Amino acid sequence: IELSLAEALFLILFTGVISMLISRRTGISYVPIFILTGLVIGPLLKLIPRDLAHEIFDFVRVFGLVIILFTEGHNLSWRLLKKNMPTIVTLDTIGLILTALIAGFIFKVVFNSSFLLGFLFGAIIGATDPATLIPLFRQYRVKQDIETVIVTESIFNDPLGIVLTLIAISMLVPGYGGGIFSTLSEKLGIYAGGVIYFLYNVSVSISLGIFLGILGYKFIKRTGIFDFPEIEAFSLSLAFLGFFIGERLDASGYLVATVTGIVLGNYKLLKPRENIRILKRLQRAIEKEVHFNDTLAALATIFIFVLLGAEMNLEVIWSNLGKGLLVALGVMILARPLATLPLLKWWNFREYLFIALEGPRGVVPSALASLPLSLALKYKSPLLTVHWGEIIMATVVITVLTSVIVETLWIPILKDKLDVG
Amino acid sequence: MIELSLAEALFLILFTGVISMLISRRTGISYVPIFILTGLVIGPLLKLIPRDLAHEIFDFVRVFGLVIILFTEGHNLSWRLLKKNMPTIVTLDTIGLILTALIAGFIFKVVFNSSFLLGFLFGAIIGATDPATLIPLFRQYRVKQDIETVIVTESIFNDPLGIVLTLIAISMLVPGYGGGIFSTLSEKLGIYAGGVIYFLYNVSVSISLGIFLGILGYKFIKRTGIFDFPEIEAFSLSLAFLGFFIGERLDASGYLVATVTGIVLGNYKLLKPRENIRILKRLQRAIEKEVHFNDTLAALATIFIFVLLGAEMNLEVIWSNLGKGLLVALGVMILARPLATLPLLKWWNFREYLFIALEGPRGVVPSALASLPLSLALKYKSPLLTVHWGEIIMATVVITVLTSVIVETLWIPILKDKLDVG
Ligand SMILES: CCCCCCCCCCCCCCCCCCCC(=O)O[C@H](COC(=O)CCCCCCCCCCCCCC)COP(=O)(O)OCCN
Ligand SMILES: CCCCCCCCO[C@@H]1O[C@H](CO)[C@@H](O)[C@H](O)[C@H]1O
């Protein structure tokens, strides 16, 4: 009486729900709880096969990522962005890159891998998910501007961490470069081609995202889309429209969708103020939309973390426990602050250090974690090996768990030393 | 016709569907023929959605969509109004349904040479009703509250049972679904008596279990204080599907379990007579948000169902038996439905009865079950049902849906004028 695929998916959902409940009730972060649940229903009870978790992940990756990043777009205020523009821009143009690179050198050293493979690991481990941190920021009443900068940086790095990961793989394997990557690389080498392609991708993604967000907003006003179930379905369709159009012209559809989310989140700012009645109407609409889509992003998160927990291979992670652990603490202590370094050039050091140290790794790399493995199994290419895929995945899991728990636990005392003085 | 990705296909269905939804609400036209026409456009007309792919999508949207749609439907039922018109409701969902399916089987078998089981399958498919496209005209013309309650509740119970009957007709024609309680009972007391007793069994067990998991659900939520986003939505979805799978493992329609669960959750006030208002407030709000989510999902499911149905038909078979199918549809509307609706017309004035009869078209559930016999034919090679006959059934169902919906949504003012002088 083994579980069918439907009962399997549902098992993931239900178990994830219970895990969520006990997580909230107890006060423990949802990340290691969801991972734990994964291992429980996974390799332990063998209720869910890892080789199936691969494919379920092959859907939940694209879907969940797009919807989650889109939902993240809404929680961004353009005002606070432009007010603290340089800091954020540095955090999402330099700090990310340097984090990924140092992390890559670390990986290369610890596992004797290539620096390109390490760069893949770093690109995966680049983005940050502080959604695990926020409740403590609130209940300990940390600086509002700090929370602003951190959260904003995350919202921006989540899709950037992806396109970074897509770069490294595109370098390792020329499979489905799209055309832009292929052309730009064949004209200006692999690395420089990667740089200019990064610039291109970012440019077109931001542009198209803003464009589609605005046009969608205006479309809503014109056609009058404020009532159930039009607003939800339309907004969803808009997000995935941005994603598919973006990916169609070789741009990060994730980033596009995120940007669209930012636009809709800042609908009150872009076009002329209407009468308070209309503003309230649009407000209600956006509230409904946000509700539905954020519910979807919640489910998606649950599935991502649980699947990851049920997909890992115990023997591989144990044979490299210490190694990947020191890679984790290595990137938490050495990489992140080193990359953060130019912050104190425009910030106070006591601020800069907290901002550096605090940022952990979360959902996005957890989704990207199995990608190199699955891609290795499928494409079956010599450059990246299946074993190294297992290595990557294991490491990513380790640094995710360790970063999350260490940040979550070391945050209280760290305020006392940085607030009081 | 450049090949799309699977994801691009799904998204295309979504986008086009939403566009057609907007257009539907704006123009005032029923969403059903707009959706189906849309699917037809992006389907065989443009070949952006290969029919094979359509089958593959519909094999998922069937399960997931139907479950969530029905579970959503459960919420909109009042036990009070049920008590108010209990015998009528029970009659319609039980007797009138079976009779409808049977007569439809007769007609279907008449139009072209077939087994009576094929026709019975056809009737069991279109057994359920969907007045969702009628309500905007009901409140528009201030129609009697009682009859609306009757029709709505009727459809609410007809949607799962219609599948159960469809589950029955399938169980006979295929050896796969055979092995089970139904096989035992039918072999024991003949196909007829066995069918009836398995009907009673499935209904009873599914209902009782749905009530059980419903109460257990409400009590659980009550104890662990599930009100804050997003615990409630996730837990609700989990609950509905739990009921589904558990119910299905006991050889009973899990859909019916989902519906009953939805009924239980819908009538939260009725469970505890006295409870301090605060609790009822938080509960009402949480339930409301949950309803928003699950109903949005239900809408998406509806769209996908109708559009997919639109893209899954082939104009060759459709045209080939065009007149035939039309005769079937008209036969069902004009003859079958009222003939099956007569039993408890004793409680209702003849004009009102003729109204109830002449109303109640076929929508979502038959649209989902339309391609079911074809898929099974393509997968299980029955000596009873063929692929082409699956095509005949799906086509006939499509025509039935279009005709019934369009007419019964369009003729309502005139009909009201006939029974209520105007
Ligand atoms: C994680 C993000 C959360 C939000 C996502 C949307 C909400 C879903 C949340 C998770 C739901 C948990 C509950 C599990 C649902 C049960 C799924 C049933 C799957 C199933 O059995 O499919 C089988 C085949 O699948 C196949 O053939 C594969 C078909 C491939 C296309 C599937 C695409 C699905 C997209 C649906 C989107 C529309 C829904 C509204 C969002 C059917 O096989 P059978 O038994 O019928 O075979 C015999 C007939 N001859
Ligand atoms: C079923 C037809 C109505 C569907 C829309 C459901 C309306 C739910 O409205 C809900 O009200 C809550 C009250 O705080 C808000 O917090 C939620 O954001 C909002 O979605």
Residue numbers in the entry:
A (entry chain B): 2 to 422
B (entry chain A): 1 to 422
Paper quotes:
H5 and H12 in the 6-helix bundle are discontinuous. dimer indicates clusters of charged residues on both sides of the membrane. transported by PaNhaP, K+ is not. structure thus serves as an excellent model for the membrane part of NHE1.
The structure was solved at 3.15  Å by SeMet-SAD. The structure was solved by SAD. ethanolamine (PE), carried over from the E. coli expression host. Six ion bridges that lock the two protomers together at pH 8 break at pH 4.
